[PDB]
């Protein structure tokens, strides 16, 4: 029982219908890109990718709509004809049209997004806001990353970054939107790096190529969760941002979320003030800052991730609960951390480590 597609037209519209044959399909299952005359829709179907890739017979307008009938996993993409005339056929198939291929074996697809704003968050970390083009539908699920790509002399360079929410605070958070055009990133600029100095040179209104999402985190790890622990070092905070928002809004069984955030100095605590206000106004959230190398008077915890520190933080309560520990940071920090969680008798199923 394989996926399939069809199409129909009215005087002014062209509709493409994708029949996934799947339950669980939603607007995160499909990415759509199109030009005036070319159309690409990739649909996530279990571990495979179903691709529609067609050069359209006539031109269509930039704005289009995408709708899912969730009972049967039917997706409809409605395009707008530039000229209200009848089409003789949909178009000429292009590379890999109507192909069903395992995701592992697929290549990254990119589209150009526009840099809209850039804000300093710490001395070396910015909040970037990119805007998808009107002719793209793309949602980045919780826990996943995308690759950014920039041209330099002779070539293009690529690095992955993990989209975040625009804020942790409800007054600045975006609402839940049928289709969000904006993607936010917290990105630390390394003066000796290759990619981030070039990203930091980009002017407002210039363009960056953004890949489709990647990553194995599955939101089902949150079903019925009661206690969530978050271990982050440095920019390993970024996957935690959307996880933290979800934890406080979309898990009715959640009793506690605890973040232990490791950094070098007070000035490296990304979003310190936002985390302090969030934690203070919601007793479900605890946040603890650990500094490896404070430069001012510091009453808080100090050091690196250790057997000692996780004993107190992850101390077992008297009652059994459904638990999840997410960890992200420098590779050795995460490898040490996961080794230490196994020593503390957490299962594979109770650990998620965000890595490449």
What are the residues binding ligand FAD (CB under 6 A)?
Answer: 145, 159-162, 185-188, 190, 192-196, 235, 238, 356
95 labeled binding residue: no
Check residue 242 and give left, alpha or beta (phi > 0: left; psi -120 to 50: alpha): alpha
Q: Which residues contact 152 (CB under 8 A, 6 or more apart)?
A: 198
Q: How far is the CB of 177 from ligand NAP (least distance, A)?
A: 25
Distance CA 200, CA 203 (A): 8
73 labeled binding residue: no
Nearer to ligand FAD, 37 or 200 (CB): 200
Nearer to ligand NAP, 66 or 232 (CB): 232
Task: Work out what residue 193 binds among ligand NAP, ligand FAD, none; the CB cut-off runs from 5 to 8 Å by kind.
Answer: ligand FAD
Pull the structure tokens for residue 295.
Answer: 């430069």
Selected range binding ligand NAP among 86-94, 175-183, 228-236, 275-283, rule: CB under 6 A: 228-236
Cα dist. 177→174, 233, 245 in Å?
Answer: 8, 31, 15
Pull the structure tokens for residue 219.
Answer: 């939101």
Q: With CA atoms as reference, report the closest residue to 227 among 325, 89, 85, 122.
A: 325
Distance CA 61, CA 35 (A): 9
Among 110, 222, 261, 262, binds ligand NAP (CB under 6 A): 262
Looking at residues 162 to 181 of the shown chain, list those that interact with ligand NAP (rule: CB under 6 A): 162
Q: How far is the CB of 43 from ligand FAD (least distance, A)?
A: 23
Distance CA 148, CA 282 (A): 35
Nearer to ligand NAP, 91 or 236 (CB): 236
- As a residue count, the chain comes to 356
Q: With CA atoms as reference, report the closest residue to 166 among 117, 230, 232.
A: 117
- The mark string for 289-328 relative to ligand NAP (x by CB under 6 A, - otherwise) is ---xx----------xx----------------------x
Distance CA 239, CA 1 (A): 35
Selected range binding ligand NAP among 62-70, 106-114, 258-266, 279-287, rule: CB under 6 A: 258-266
User: Is the sign of the CA dihedral 108, 112, 113, 115 positive or negative?
Assistant: positive
Distance CA 100, CA 96 (A): 9
Q: Is 261 in the site for ligand NAP (CB under 6 A)?
A: no
Task: Work out what residue 177 binds among ligand FAD, ligand NAP, none; the CB cut-off runs from 5 to 8 Å by kind.
Answer: none
Binding residues for FAD: 200-215, 227-259
Q: Which residues bind ligand NAP (CB under 6 A)?
A: 162, 188, 233-236, 238-239, 262-264, 268, 292-293, 304-305, 328-330, 332-333, 336, 354-356
């Amino acid at each position: 029982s394989y996926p399939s597609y069809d199409w129909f037209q009215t005087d002014s519209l062209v509709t493409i219908a994708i029949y996934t044959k799947q339950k669980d399909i939603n607007l995160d299952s499909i990415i759509v890109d199109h030009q005036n005359d070319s159309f690409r829709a990739e649909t996530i179907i279990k571990d495979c990718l179903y691709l529609i890739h067609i050069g359209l017979s006539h031109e269509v307008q930039e704005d289009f709509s995408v709708r899912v009938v969730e009972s049967v996993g039917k997706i409809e993409i409605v395009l707008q004809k530039k000229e209200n005339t009848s089409w003789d056929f949909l178009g000429h198939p292009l590379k890999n049209h109507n192909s069903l291929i395992p995701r592992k074996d697929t290549g990254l697809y990119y589209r150009k997004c526009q840099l809209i704003s850039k804000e300093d968050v710490t001395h070396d970390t910015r909040l970037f806001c990119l805007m998808l083009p009107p002719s793209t539908h793309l949602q980045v699920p919780i826990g996943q990353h995308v690759y950014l790509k920039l041209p330099i002399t002779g070539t293009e360079i690529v690095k992955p970054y993990t989209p975040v929410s625009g804020s942790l605070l409800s007054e600045f958070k975006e609402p839940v939107l049928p289709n969000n055009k904006y993607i936010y990133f917290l990105i630390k600029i390394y003066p000796t790096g290759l990619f981030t100095p070039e990203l930091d040179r980009l002017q407002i209104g210039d363009f960056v190529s953004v890949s489709s999402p990647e990553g194995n985190f599955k939101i089902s790890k949150f079903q019925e969760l009661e206690d969530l622990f978050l271990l982050a070092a440095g920019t390993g905070f970024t996957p935690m941002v959307k996880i933290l928002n979800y934890a406080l809004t979309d898990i009715p069984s959640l009793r506690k979320v605890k973040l232990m955030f490791f950094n070098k100095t007070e000035d490296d605590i990304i979003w310190r003030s936002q985390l302090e206000k969030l934690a203070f106004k919601d007793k479900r959230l605890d946040v603890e800052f650990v500094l490896s190398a404070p430069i001012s008077e510091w009453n808080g915890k100090q050091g690196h991730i250790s057997p000692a520190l996780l004993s107190e933080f992850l101390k077992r309560n008297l009652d059994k609960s459904k638990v999840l520990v997410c960890i992200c940071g420098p590779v050795p920090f995460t490898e040490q951390g996961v080794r230490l969680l196994h020593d503390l008798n957490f299962s594979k199923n109770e650990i998620h480590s965000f890595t490449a």
